[PDB]
């Protein structure tokens, strides 16, 4: 019940961008695929339905296809008004949506994320609580996949991350928190902030011994 689409696809104005939806036959294969746009602070918008068909009102430069266990949404002549969250969906006999593909009409080179991770303050541990704050800055496009790691081991708990926002330098910034018990904090040699951006993966780390 998880339709696979990349977090980000990004081209220059005038270019083609294609967004894929891979999964399984039970989900995508035997079923209809539908694509939805979502501008920030707006309800989703139907782009494509029944794999490849198109509504009236949608610019012809929005294409759809389904070849077995894969489905594709294309966008020629990219314009800033296409910057949005694109989700793929489907039915089954309701159904399921995609992970969420962001699209960014590049107006600048890819800037890689400057990661500044803060450990829980001694003042915060003086309340039997603890929060690690990873702060990812100066990146473009605005799509980052943050994973935390206790030692080299993973961690699922306490993770709250924000949807990136444009700064004053027009590059995006986001933040992820890790809510921990002070014992857990003091029970690992190091926690770490894995930040994946456009394929690249950056890791900042802290230890209680600091």
């Amino acid at each position: 019940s998880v339709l696979t689409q990349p977090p980000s696809v990004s081209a220059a104005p005038g270019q083609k961008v294609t967004i894929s939806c891979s999964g399984s036959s039970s989900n995508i294969g035997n079923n209809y695929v539908s694509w939805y746009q979502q501008l920030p602070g707006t309800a989703p918008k139907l782009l494509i339905y029944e794999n490849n068909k198109r509504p009236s009102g949608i610019p012809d430069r929005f294409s759809g296809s389904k070849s077995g266990t894969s489905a594709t949404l294309g966008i020629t002549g990219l314009q800033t008004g296409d910057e949005a969250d694109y989700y793929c969906g489907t039915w089954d006999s309701g159904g399921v949506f995609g992970t969420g593909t962001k699209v960014t009409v590049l107006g600048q080179p890819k800037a890689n994320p400057t990661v500044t991770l803060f450990p829980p303050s001694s003042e915060e541990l003086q309340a039997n609580k603890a929060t690690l704050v990873c702060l990812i800055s100066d990146f473009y496009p605005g799509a980052v996949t943050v994973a935390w790691k206790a030692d080299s081991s993973p961690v699922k708990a306490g993770v709250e991350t924000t949807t990136p926002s444009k700064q004053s330098n027009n590059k995006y910034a986001a933040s992820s928190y890790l809510s921990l018990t002070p014992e857990q904090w003091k029970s690992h040699r190091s926690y770490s902030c894995q930040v994946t951006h456009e394929g690249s993966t950056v890791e900042k780390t802290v230890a209680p011994t600091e």
Binding site: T116, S165, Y177, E210
Partner: protein, 222 residues
Amino acid sequence: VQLVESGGGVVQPGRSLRLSCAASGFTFSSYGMHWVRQAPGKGLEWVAVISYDGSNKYYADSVKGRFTISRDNSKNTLYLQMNSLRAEDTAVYYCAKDLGESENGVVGAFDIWGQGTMVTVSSASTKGPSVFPLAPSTSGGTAALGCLVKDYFPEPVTVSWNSGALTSGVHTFPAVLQSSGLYSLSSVVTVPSSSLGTQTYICNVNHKPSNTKVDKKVEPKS
């Protein structure tokens, strides 16, 4: 066509809430209706479905037991009767039409959506902000400091630095909904790593509703 949700507000977990979606600009009686939720700032999560008549009803496993989507074709309104609310049901619920097309329910394609009413389930009254210092480490020639405004409730917090005398180098991130039904955000200042020891740095947080005005002098460690 227009879908206008309604009845979205704060609620205590365990208690109930019923969202209303005034549909217009089409038949409604001949289209199935969906509910979709989008927790800030995650993706679209398919919630529930009701047929054009009201026969078929389907929900997610995360909703299977405690929600009951209904609908009133007389008033052209869709209802999501939400009982026994939880924390991770907090989301922006979306009244979404179904596209039943091409002759001989119904199908899963949502041509029209509504504005979407935000439901914030939280066993919490107005909590004052606890502020913590984000003491620098630093990646030369620049260093970073900040203030973790955490465990506050509700949501308008205003942060400044040095009582307004520090606008540049600063970046205040959006608030996040925590695992305690409260909120958290961080304020950051990016300064010369050489200026650390000298310049005093204070984050002047101000939760207006709860009437709290926290001030934390941020400095490095040792």
